[PDB]
C-alpha cells in the first residue's frame, strides 16, 4: 500500500527513469546510471558497466560501482568489494547493509538509497524523495515530468541513443565505442495482441491501476521481433511489469507456468512473485524497519526452515545454522574464547557467558 521511486534496467537494454520514461539503449560501455550531481555535497553515484554479451537475448551486466559518502562498493556476478576489500555476505557496517539472496544482490544505505540486482539483466534503484531534482544519468532528473511532455531551449531534444551516449564514463587507455545509429528501427506492431494478452492476465488484476501498461507493451513488442529465437526477452519484460507492480505497493499473482516461462529455485526454495521482505536467516541480520516495506519476488524457504546466508547450504532448521567470526565458519556447538567470555554457537547466534578476567 506504499510505493517507491524506482529507476531500472532489464532485458534487451530497456531502461526506465524515475519519471517513468522507458527507452532502449544498447550501449556496451561504462555509464553513469544515477548520481547526486546537484547536491551541494554529492551523496552518491552509481555506475553501470554493461560489457559484451549475447545478442537476441537479455543483456548482461558486468559490474556495478557504488560510491556513497566515503564508501565504495564494487559488485560483480560473484564478488562484493567494500573499499577495496573483498567481503563475505551479509556484510553490515554503519548505515550500510550488503546482502546476497539467490534472487538478488541487494545494497541498503541509510543515506536514502537502495539497490537490487539479479546478477544478470535486471537492475533497479530506489531513491529517497529528498533527491528530487538532484540526479544525473540514464535514470533522469527525478523532477516529475516525462520526455514526451518537454523540451529545452534552442529546440534541443535528445534521442535515446544520444542521451545514453552522453552518460559514458571514459577509462584512460581503454577503447570502447558507442553503438551505431540503428538502421530502420521497425516498430513491431503485429504482436500487440499476444503482449496485451499477457500483461492483462488475471495475475495482474491489482496492477492495472498502479503501473501504466503502455510503456511495457511497446517494450514487449520490441522483444518479440528483436529476440525472435525464443521467449527470453519478452519474459524479462513481463517480470519487469510484475516488479513495477510490487514496487508501486501492489501484489502481482503467480503468472508463470510450465510453458509460460518457468522459474525455479535451487534445493527446496520456493519462487513467489510476492513474498515477505523479511525472512529469518542464519545470520539474523534482517531486523530493521525494512520488514514494513512492500512485498517482492524471490526465493523463500518453507515454513520451519531459515535461509542459510552463512554456510550457503540452502534452507535449514535454525538449530543447524552456521556461525561466523573473523572469516571462519562454525558449526552449532563449537565454542570460542575472547577475553572474560566464552561463546558457543547456538541457533546461528553467539551466546556468551561471562568469565573472570
SS3 call for 235: helix
**Distance in Å, CB of 115 to ligand NAG, minimum:** 23
**Distance in Å, CB of 258 to Cu ion, minimum:** 29
Q: Tell me how far CA of residue 76 lies from CA of 32, 56, 106, 112, 314, in angstroms.
A: 17, 23, 12, 23, 22
Nearest residue (CB) to Cu ion, 2 versus 353: 2
x/- mask, ligand NAG, residues 88-127, rule CB under 6 A, reads ----------------------------------------
Q: Which does 132 bind (CB under 5 to 8 A by kind): ligand NAG, Cu ion, none?
A: ligand NAG
Q: Answer yes or no whether residue 42 interacts with ligand NAG by CB under 6 A.
A: no
Among 4, 100, 132, 192, binds ligand NAG (CB under 6 A): 132
Nearest residue (CB) to Cu ion, 211 versus 321: 211
SS3 call for 1: coil
Interface ranges with Cu ion (CB under 5 A)? 4, 126, 247
Q: Tell me how far CA of residue 189 lies from CA of 87, 196, 237, in angstroms.
A: 48, 12, 16
Nearest residue (CB) to ligand NAG, 41 versus 354: 41
Nearest residue (CB) to Cu ion, 227 versus 248: 248
Q: Which does 133 bind (CB under 5 to 8 A by kind): Cu ion, ligand NAG, none?
A: ligand NAG
Q: State which residue has the least CB distance to ligand NAG.
A: 133
Grid cell, residue 131, equals 533527491
Q: Alpha-carbon distance 73 to 75, whole Å?
A: 6
* Nearest to 275, CA basis, from 248, 252, 304: 252
Q: Which residues contact 139 (CB under 8 A, 6 or more apart)?
A: 7, 15, 17, 18, 33, 34, 125
Nearest residue (CB) to ligand NAG, 132 versus 168: 132
**Distance in Å, CB of 215 to Cu ion, minimum:** 18
Nearest residue (CB) to Cu ion, 4 versus 168: 4
Nearest residue (CB) to Cu ion, 216 versus 330: 216
Nearest residue (CB) to Cu ion, 19 versus 308: 19
**Distance in Å, CB of 143 to ligand NAG, minimum:** 5
**Distance in Å, CB of 133 to ligand NAG, minimum:** 4
Q: Which does 4 bind (CB under 5 to 8 A by kind): ligand NAG, Cu ion, none?
A: Cu ion
SS3 call for 100: strand
**Distance in Å, CB of 145 to ligand NAG, minimum:** 7
Q: Alpha-carbon distance 194 to 311, whole Å?
A: 44
Grid cell, residue 255, equals 503468472
**Distance in Å, CB of 142 to ligand NAG, minimum:** 9
The H-or-E segment that residue 236 falls in is helix 232-247
- Under 8 Å between Cβ of 234 and 220: yes
Among 1, 40, 54, 133, binds ligand NAG (CB under 6 A): 133
Q: Which residues contact 278 (CB under 8 A, 6 or more apart)?
A: 286, 287, 290, 291
DSSP letter for each residue of 268-313: T-EEEEEE-S---BSS----SGGGGS--EEEEEPPTT-EE-TTT--
Q: Which of residues 161-200 bind ligand NAG (CB under 6 A)?
A: none
By CB under 6 A, the count of residues binding ligand NAG is 3
x/- mask, ligand NAG, residues 142-161, rule CB under 6 A, reads -x------------------
Number of CB atoms found within 10 A of residue 229's CB: 9
Degrees to nearest 5, angle at CA 130 with 125 and 136: 55
Site residues for ligand NAG per CB under 6 A: 132-133, 143
Amino acid at each position: 500500500n506504499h510505493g517507491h521511486n524506482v529507476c531500472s534496467t532489464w532485458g534487451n537494454f530497456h531502461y526506465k527513469t524515475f519519471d517513468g520514461d522507458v527507452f532502449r539503449f544498447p550501449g556496451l560501455c561504462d555509464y553513469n546510471f544515477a548520481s547526486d550531481c546537484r547536491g551541494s555535497y554529492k551523496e552518491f553515484a552509481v555506475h553501470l558497466k554493461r560489457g559484451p554479451g549475447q545478442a537476441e537475448a537479455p543483456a548482461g551486466v558486468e559490474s556495478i560501482l557504488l560510491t556513497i559518502k566515503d564508501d565504495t562498493i564494487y559488485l560483480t556476478r560473484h564478488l562484493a568489494v567494500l573499499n577495496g576489500a573483498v567481503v563475505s555476505t551479509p556484510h553490515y557496517s554503519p548505515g550500510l547493509l550488503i546482502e546476497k539472496s539467490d534472487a538478488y544482490t541487494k545494497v541498503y544505505s541509510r543515506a536514502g538509497l537502495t539497490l537490487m540486482w539479479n546478477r544478470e539483466d535486471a537492475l533497479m534503484l530506489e531513491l529517497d524523495t529528498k533527491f528530487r531534482n538532484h540526479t544525473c544519468g540514464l535514470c533522469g532528473d527525478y523532477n516529475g515530468l516525462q520526455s514526451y511532455s518537454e523540451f529545452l531551449s534552442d529546440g534541443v531534444l535528445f534521442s535515446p541513443l544520444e542521451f545514453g551516449n552522453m552518460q559514458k564514463i571514459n577509462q584512460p587507455d581503454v577503447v570502447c565505442e558507442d553503438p551505431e545509429e540503428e538502421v530502420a528501427p521497425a516498430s513491431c506492431s503485429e504482436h500487440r495482441a499476444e503482449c496485451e494478452r499477457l500483461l492483462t492476465a488475471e495475475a495482474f488484476a491489482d496492477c492495472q491501476d498502479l503501473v501504466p501498461l503502455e510503456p511495457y507493451l511497446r517494450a514487449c513488442q520490441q522483444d518479440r521481433c528483436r529476440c525472435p529465437g525464443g521467449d527470453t526477452c519478452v519474459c524479462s519484460t513481463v517480470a519487469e511489469f510484475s516488479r513495477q507492480c510490487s514496487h508501486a505497493g501492489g501484489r502481482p499473482g503467480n503468472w508463470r507456468t510450465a510453458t509460460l516461462c518457468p522459474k525455479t529455485c535451487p534445493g527446496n526454495l520456493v519462487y513467489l512473485e510476492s513474498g515477505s521482505p523479511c525472512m529469518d536467516t542464519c545470520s539474523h541480520l534482517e531486523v530493521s524497519s525494512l520488514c514494513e516495506e512492500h512485498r517482492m519476488d524471490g526465493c523463500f524457504c518453507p515454513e520451519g526452515t531459515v535461509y542459510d546466508d552463512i554456510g550457503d547450504s540452502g534452507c535449514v532448521p535454525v538449530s543447524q545454522c552456521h556461525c561466523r567470526l573473523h572469516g571462519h565458519l562454525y558449526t552449532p556447538g563449537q565454542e570460542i574464547t575472547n577475553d572474560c567470555e566464552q561463546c558457543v554457537c547456538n541457533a546461528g547466534r553467539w551466546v556468551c557467558k561471562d568469565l573472570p578476567c
